[PDB]
Amino acid sequence: MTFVALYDYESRTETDLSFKKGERLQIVNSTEGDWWLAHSLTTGRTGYIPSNYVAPS
Amino acid sequence: MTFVALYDYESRTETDLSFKKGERLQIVNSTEGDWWLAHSLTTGRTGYIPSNYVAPS
């Protein structure tokens, strides 16, 4: 639903949202799901993944 | 803990992780938390936010 920002956040990529402390934010549904920071045991690379693309082992 | 990829995913920014169906992935803890797609009621902009920066209204 609706959240409020506790801190300023400055965007680091083309896809993140910059916002100031106090802003009201609404979660938006997408098919990808929440994103998680993940490490691939298979390739050794690391970065954010769309959680709806994976399942527990 | 440990997850397996259900689908290929091709990275779209400098910070996401590309992976192939079948890869084993491990969640990595960061201070930012999971990332959510959010819309700012305050500014009208939209993009991903670090969930540990916000709290329910």
UniProtKB/Swiss-Prot annotation, chains A, B:
Give start-end of the signal peptide. Answer: none
Relate the assembly described in the record.
Forms a complex with polyoma virus middle T antigen. Interacts with AFAP-110. Interacts with GJA1 and PXN.
Q: Where is the SH3 domain?
A: 2-57
Tissues with expression = Expressed to high levels, and with a high degree of kinase activity, in certain fully differentiated cells such as neurons, platelets and macrophages. Isoform 1 is widely expressed. Isoform 2 is expressed only in the muscle.
Name of this chain's protein: Proto-oncogene tyrosine-protein kinase Src
The organism's place on the tree of life at top rank:
Eukaryota
Annotated localization: Cell membrane; Mitochondrion inner membrane; Endosome membrane; Nucleus
Q: How is it modified after translation?
A: The phosphorylated form is termed pp60c-src. S-nitrosylation is important for activation of its kinase activity.
Q: What part of the entire protein does this chain span?
A: 85 to 140 of 533
According to its UniProt entry, the function of this protein is described as: Non-receptor protein tyrosine kinase which is activated following engagement of many different classes of cellular receptors including immune response receptors, integrins and other adhesion receptors, receptor protein tyrosine kinases, G protein-coupled receptors as well as cytokine receptors. Participates in signaling pathways that control a diverse spectrum of biological activities including gene transcription, immune response, cell adhesion, cell cycle progression, apoptosis, migration, and transformation.
The entry assigns this protein to a family as follows: Belongs to the protein kinase superfamily. Tyr protein kinase family. SRC subfamily.
Which organism is the protein's source?
Gallus gallus
